[PDB]
Structure 1
């Protein structure tokens, strides 16, 4: 995973009404998210999920070239009857350990 743009959120150090988790725990859960891509070198993934329950790996809008490997990997729990998340997950190739500060 490279970077995530969740919708109604200014920045990582705040919350979102409708989820039990903080933003920070969510994207650290996404740091462990594994996926397989074939035809590209970068790709943007998208999830849209409402309703009470856990947010699994299944709720992304999958394609034919991308492939999640662990469908059970949880992200968060929606707690509201009517709330949703809509992030866009940018994913690219790479090699090694790259912190966020050393870029550009």
Structure 2
């Protein structure tokens, strides 16, 4: 009776988003303790990238319209919140969009640099209807954690930003939903051992080999205040 320690044994990709990670082996109690202390951290705080500020030329606020587009500009701001990017080198980038001609404006038409990579290129942003009409915007992407609304950012700034720089609400977390299952492990003599199958579902801006390592680094950091300091 000493212990047995788990290990990251298997990772498979159902789709570009859906993944299923197993851990093996566990004892009796720890199969249902780690499986609930890894859902409560992977949903709350995981670092991702999100769109923060959109600046379309010719337009002052978000409650007007532009010529030759189907949606209002507020619908374009609602479309640009669901954009799954991945910034590797820097910590804040600015992307440009330019389009002219009849047809939709997909997310693949953004002139990206070498580091950022729009992972879902079939996204839909706008709809152009006239030949002479065009669109042009600059899009700021930051790195964050959790959910930061627009009122907090407009309250926690002091420099005068120019009229036209619209603000978007930022939801940073990549993980959409996550479940876990505990099945009887396949060990030949220690029969009552358990395994833990964490079933992750996200968008394409995270790696399931890295998310569990971040979510266990956080848990081994927060328990460091319990192991020595009383």
Q: What TM-score do the two structures reach when normalised by structure 2?
A: 0.44
Structure 2 distance, partners of 1:30, 1:6, is: 12
Structure 2 distance, partners of 1:94, 1:40, is: 13
Task: Flag structure 2 segments of 5+ consecutive residues without an equivalent.
Answer: 1-50, 153-229
Structure 1 distance, partners of 2:56, 2:109, is: 14
Q: What's the CA shift for 1:82? A: 1.3
Report the equivalent of 1:78.
128
Task: Flag structure 1 segments of 5+ consecutive residues without an equivalent.
Answer: none
Note the aligned Cα RMSD (angstroms): 3.7
Q: What's the CA shift for 1:58? A: 1.1
Query: Counterpart of 2:151 in 1: which secondary structure?
Result: coil
Query: Counterpart of 2:111 in 1: which secondary structure?
Result: coil
Structure 2 distance, partners of 1:54, 1:40, is: 30
Q: Greater Rg, structure 1 or structure 2?
A: 2
Q: What TM-score do the two structures reach when normalised by structure 1?
A: 0.96
Q: What's the CA shift for 1:64? A: 0.5
Count residues with an aligned counterpart.
Answer: 103
Query: Counterpart of 1:35 in 2: which secondary structure?
Result: coil
Moved over 3 A (4+): none
Q: What's the CA shift for 1:77? A: 0.6
More helix by share: 2
